[PDB]
Ligand binder design. Structure first.
Ligand SMILES: [Ca+2]
Length: 235
């Protein structure tokens, strides 16, 4: 009986990850019976050192992720057992981004200390370290509130309007080349550089869901953040 045979686990052994990185378990064969999922979860019981509570979420018939309830300790070695498989990984700095829809800001802290790039005359900027002018999703396509984690980081990725439900050649379609792209949902939500959107930054929520930053702020956050680091969206 190898129905719950585990092919692999993320983080990999010795991987360096951000401080909300889930434990992602990939099974050797799909578990197509949702009733067998609770037994599968028990067979892949996640035991970390330091101890952490979490919640299982199935991403596919053969992938379940265990989402920690709290952040891992930064700059640490986390020991990890996933049903007998003994592993470990490392965390880097706690790089946390908090988007405020009402304040039109994106606040970046590193290990608790708010910080941003060294500012180099005609654009909004706050005198407060780490607080970046941002533009969230407009009321038609709002940025959803929640607790996210960085799923991937890409340079010069092309984003279409088909991600929010609009063909490219449609009245309000788009096809953008985006310089710095920090992906925070599998659906296609990003923190990213939006130079065309410079006037709205810090003032208006004019994007279609994504968290828009200046190129300089996006570049700094992109270079600071790691896959697994948390991103909070608040009203
Ligand atoms: Ca990493």
């Amino acid at each position: 009986s190898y129905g719950f045979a585990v092919a692999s686990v993320l983080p990999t052994r010795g991987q360096v990850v951000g401080v909300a990185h889930p434990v992602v378990v990939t099974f050797s064969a799909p578990i197509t019976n949702p009733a067998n999922r609770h037994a599968a979860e028990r067979a892949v019981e996640v035991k970390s050192t330091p101890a952490m509570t979490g919640k299982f979420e199935w991403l596919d018939n053969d992938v379940v992720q265990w989402v920690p309830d709290r952040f891992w300790p930064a700059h640490s070695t986390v020991e990890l057992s996933v049903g007998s498989l003994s592993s470990d990984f490392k965390t880097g700095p706690a790089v946390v981004g908090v988007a405020s829809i009402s304040q039109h800001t994106f606040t970046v802290s590193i290990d608790g200390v708010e910080e941003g790039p060294p500012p180099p005359h005609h654009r909004v900027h706050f005198g407060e370290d780490g607080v970046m002018p941002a533009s969230m999703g407009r009321p038609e396509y709002p940025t959803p509130v929640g607790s996210y984690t960085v799923l991937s980081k890409e340079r010069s990725v092309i984003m279409d309007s088909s991600s929010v439900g609009i063909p490219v050649d449609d009245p309000d379609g788009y096809r953008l080349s985006v310089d710095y792209a920090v992906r925070i949902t599998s659906r296609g939500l990003y923190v990213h550089s939006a130079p065309w959107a410079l006037p709205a930054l810090g003032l208006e929520n004019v994007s279609h869901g994504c968290i828009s930053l200046s190129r300089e702020d996006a570049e700094w956050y992109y270079n600071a953040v790691d896959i697994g680091d948390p991103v909070i969206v608040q009203e």
